Design an enzyme around this catalytic site. Structure first.
Site, short mmCIF file in Angstrom:
data_model
loop_
_atom_site.label_atom_id
_atom_site.label_comp_id
_atom_site.label_asym_id
_atom_site.label_seq_id
_atom_site.Cartn_x
_atom_site.Cartn_y
_atom_site.Cartn_z
N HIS A 151 0.85 -1.17 0.00
CA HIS A 151 0.00 0.00 0.00
C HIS A 151 0.90 1.24 0.00
O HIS A 151 2.13 1.16 0.06
CB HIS A 151 -0.94 -0.05 1.20
CG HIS A 151 -2.00 -1.06 1.04
ND1 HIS A 151 -3.10 -0.86 0.25
CD2 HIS A 151 -2.10 -2.32 1.52
CE1 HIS A 151 -3.84 -1.97 0.27
NE2 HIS A 151 -3.26 -2.85 1.04
N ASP B 22 -0.35 6.84 -3.58
CA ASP B 22 -1.47 6.43 -4.42
C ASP B 22 -1.87 7.55 -5.38
O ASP B 22 -2.19 7.28 -6.53
CB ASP B 22 -2.79 6.20 -3.69
CG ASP B 22 -2.93 4.92 -2.91
OD1 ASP B 22 -1.88 4.26 -2.71
OD2 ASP B 22 -4.10 4.60 -2.50
C1 CO6 Z 1 -6.19 0.55 0.42
C2 CO6 Z 1 -5.79 1.64 -0.59
C3 CO6 Z 1 -6.54 2.91 -0.26
C4 CO6 Z 1 -4.25 1.93 -0.85
O1 CO6 Z 1 -3.47 2.50 -0.08
S1 CO6 Z 1 -3.95 1.21 -2.54
C5 CO6 Z 1 -2.44 0.81 -3.45
C6 CO6 Z 1 -2.65 -0.75 -3.53
N1 CO6 Z 1 -1.62 -1.41 -4.31
C7 CO6 Z 1 -1.73 -1.57 -5.63
O2 CO6 Z 1 -2.80 -1.39 -6.20
C8 CO6 Z 1 -0.51 -1.96 -6.43
C9 CO6 Z 1 -0.79 -3.00 -7.51
N2 CO6 Z 1 -1.73 -4.03 -7.07
C10 CO6 Z 1 -1.37 -4.98 -6.23
O3 CO6 Z 1 -0.23 -5.06 -5.78
C11 CO6 Z 1 -2.44 -6.02 -5.92
O4 CO6 Z 1 -3.56 -5.88 -6.81
C12 CO6 Z 1 -2.93 -5.97 -4.47
C13 CO6 Z 1 -3.52 -4.59 -4.16
C14 CO6 Z 1 -1.74 -6.25 -3.54
C15 CO6 Z 1 -3.99 -7.04 -4.18
O5 CO6 Z 1 -3.45 -8.36 -4.49
P1 CO6 Z 1 -4.48 -9.55 -4.89
O6 CO6 Z 1 -5.82 -9.38 -4.29
O7 CO6 Z 1 -3.58 -10.72 -4.80
O8 CO6 Z 1 -4.79 -9.19 -6.42
P2 CO6 Z 1 -3.91 -9.33 -7.75
O9 CO6 Z 1 -2.65 -10.06 -7.54
O10 CO6 Z 1 -3.81 -7.97 -8.32
O11 CO6 Z 1 -4.84 -10.24 -8.70
C16 CO6 Z 1 -6.27 -10.00 -8.78
C17 CO6 Z 1 -6.96 -11.27 -9.21
O12 CO6 Z 1 -8.32 -10.92 -9.55
C18 CO6 Z 1 -8.63 -11.50 -10.79
N3 CO6 Z 1 -9.66 -10.71 -11.41
C19 CO6 Z 1 -9.67 -9.34 -11.58
N4 CO6 Z 1 -10.77 -8.91 -12.13
C20 CO6 Z 1 -11.53 -10.05 -12.34
C21 CO6 Z 1 -12.78 -10.26 -12.92
N5 CO6 Z 1 -13.53 -9.27 -13.38
N6 CO6 Z 1 -13.25 -11.53 -12.98
C22 CO6 Z 1 -12.49 -12.52 -12.49
N7 CO6 Z 1 -11.28 -12.45 -11.93
C23 CO6 Z 1 -10.86 -11.17 -11.89
C24 CO6 Z 1 -7.33 -11.50 -11.54
O13 CO6 Z 1 -7.48 -12.35 -12.65
C25 CO6 Z 1 -6.38 -11.98 -10.44
O14 CO6 Z 1 -6.48 -13.40 -10.35
P3 CO6 Z 1 -5.16 -14.31 -10.01
O15 CO6 Z 1 -3.85 -13.67 -10.33
O16 CO6 Z 1 -5.32 -15.50 -10.94
O17 CO6 Z 1 -5.32 -14.69 -8.56
#
Ligand code: CO6
Ligand code: CO6
Lengths: 360, 357
Positions: B123, B153
């Protein structure tokens, strides 16, 4: 000139804070940026790395000749940036209406704190003033102390220069249809308010209070905060999601059965005490190793001087060296039209040499 | 749809933090934004304003296919997943380039597309810890304090994604082609703080927390508690503004240490603390209205709707629960309109009909 903004021509009326930062980033991404300062300054090659990717020129805009050489540059440019109080460019005869007469394609970009009108529009200010009025500053810091400024990151840059950039670039998109420029009015008080739109949304749904230091993202949550380690240095914990939090606990050596629930806010004092004692039992670089490839959301809090030794920073070339210090490489990054390393500040140039180079 | 980005089409793969924010701002400025979420009423996250929401299991054949049909019709795609995620969905850059070589493919991450931390969860507070920013924020006698999630962010995140999307669209007009925008929060936030890296190089910024011109160490750039327990902010860097502040406080400049004698800052601060403490916040707001003293009341969110300068410039509009910021920045000829609240989920075929083929 390398980068996606190659061919873009920019005239910057020299100011302080957000205006030069915006101009830097346009330069960073390939724009041809020409900075008009007053001769009162001049005085050799600048030591201010924020003035990278620039041509600098001198001109008394108060004179007739200055005004006309300036209007000559503006006539041949895509964008003008100014960050003076409202009315300064008007009275100088570089107002929007005057520029519209020599170049109706111009993006006329006005960078202020308070905006172009209203009661505070003529008051001097800096970042801390602009974020004080829209609720932001009040939300920053510990609950038991007065608010602390987040440097000048939120009003000047995040809520200032960056909104100016988006405006400039959005207006260039619009000009593709219309064949016409327009005025971009970027005020830090507005831009910073959109930067914090999340808090305004959560506030409406009862998920954010006005009490400083008592929310999920301001330091109030024991799982989103910094912790002092055995050596007096710090780690950052950001383990919002339960599966990351559980990974953090395991690495700390605390059994979940012995702690209060992660989100039982009434027991946050106990939970903080437990996490505090645990993190305090080893040094920062220990925790850095333990958590290095994990989803525990635990990272070492590095000082500027240590950043250049962090493997992930080194390997992605986030920084480059220049004149007794690192500087950040341009962001963001582009697959086909990559930015190049920034050109350092140069000696001044004659405003004629530029008008000549720009076809004249 | 009002605003300079009228007619821009954006497909947003639903995530958290910076991607939704960027999408929001594109929407605010009149882009046509379609957000694909997963099937697991009307969303009451006002950050989802100016959207059409569709659901689709992107792991199914029909969800993938429907999504590639959107993307074929669109100008920009935003995704904020860990690296590799879109690739394995069959929605990676190269799959998208097959259906649309003009697409701006915008990837929003914290750590970047490659490198040792590229698969670590994270985060805001993590991304700003690694590049020196978090360490520099807060009082010197205390541990660093997160500046909400504004710097990683939003400021160093969503805003750089936007600058990248819009710069790529400009490059597209001369080349006819899209490309990939890689916006990492660790990068953007570092450019956001370039002024400190500049000043460290010129010996005008130190790694000591609480000891600098803009971190709260300077008595003339800090908050002060008033007689009522509320706060003012002082930002009187320029000597002429500083002088004006001292006059309005009732302090004779001859009795004080020099503004910029840092060894005597503790002493100067004590003198200003006593002065500000002797009247309430609103008194100071009055005294310093129309001045260049750079003294402003520190309002809490719930007071902002009562401040004349805020009201008269319509920085906010009223929505459901309460106030939200109007779009920024502002445009003379093609002005944004007030945001459309988060709508009800629509079917993805409807959108495709709307968008031609
Ligand atoms: C709390 C807030 C306010 C902050 O301070 S936010 C800054 C958050 N960090 C980021 O966004 C940086 C980049 N993102 C990430 O590092 C990661 O998304 C995260 C935030 C750590 C969350 O990790 P995870 O929940 O393991 O999600 P991800 O690795 O991104 O993968 C998402 C999964 O959803 C799946 N997905 C996404 N959309 C769909 C839909 N529509 N249908 C089906 N499956 C889906 C996607 O295929 C992934 O599946 P697998 O890789 O096969 O498991
Ligand atoms: C980085 C740190 C410091 C921060 O936190 S920065 C955020 C600072 N605030 C802003 O930039 C918001 C908008 N700007 C301002 O409010 C004001 O520029 C300021 C910063 C308060 C400085 O105020 P002043 O020094 O009163 O300048 P302004 O009112 O803008 O007027 C600029 C003057 O320069 C003159 N000018 C500017 N360029 C030239 C040239 N090239 N030649 C001649 N005269 C010139 C202009 O004609 C004005 O002179 P006057 O006629 O005597 O009024």
């Amino acid at each position: 000139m390398a980068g996606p903004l190659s061919g873009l021509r920019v005239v910057e009326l020299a100011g302080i804070g957000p205006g030069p930062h915006a101009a830097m980033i346009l330069g960073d991404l390939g724009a041809d940026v020409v900075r008009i300062d007053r001769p009162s300054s001049v005085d050799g090659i600048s030591r201010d790395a924020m003035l990278r990717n620039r041509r600098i020129v001198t001109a008394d805009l108060k004179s007739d000749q200055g005004l006309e050489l300036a209007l000559k540059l503006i006539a041949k440019a895509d964008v003008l940036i100014e960050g003076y109080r409202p009315g300064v460019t008007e009275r100088l005869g570089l107002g929007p209406e005057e520029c519209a007469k020599v170049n109706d394609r111009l993006i006329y970009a006005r960078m202020t704190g308070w905006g172009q009108t209203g009661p505070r529009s003529q008051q001097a200010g800096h970042d801390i003033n602009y974020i004080s009025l829209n609720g932001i500053l009040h939300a920053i810091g510990r609950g038991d102390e007065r608010p602390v400024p987040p440097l000048n990151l939120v009003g000047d840059f995040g809520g200032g220069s960056m909104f100016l950039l988006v405006g400039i670039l959005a207006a260039l998109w619009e000009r593709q249809s219309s064949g016409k420029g327009q005025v971009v009015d970027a005020a830090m008080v507005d831009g910073s308010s959109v930067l914090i739109q999340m808090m305004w949304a959560m506030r409406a749904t009862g998920m954010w209070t006005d009490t400083r230091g008592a929310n999920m993202l301001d330091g109030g949550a024991p799982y989103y905060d910094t912790y002092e380690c055995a050596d007096g240095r710090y780690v950052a914990v950001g383990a919002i999601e339960p599966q990351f939090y559980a990974a953090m606990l395991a690495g700390l050596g605390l059994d979940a059965a012995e702690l209060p629930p992660q989100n039982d806010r009434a027991r946050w004092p106990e939970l903080r005490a437990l996490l505090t004692e645990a993190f305090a039992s080893h040094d920062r670089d220990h925790w850095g190793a333990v958590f290095a490839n994990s989803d525990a959301c635990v990272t070492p809090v590095l000082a500027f001087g240590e950043v250049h030794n962090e493997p992930h920073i080194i390997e992605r070339n986030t920084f480059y060296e220049a004149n007794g210090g690192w500087q950040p490489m341009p962001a963001p990054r582009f697959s086909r039209t990559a930015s190049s390393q920034p050109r350092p500040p140069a000696a001044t140039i004659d405003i004629e040499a530029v008008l000549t180079d720009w076809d004249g």
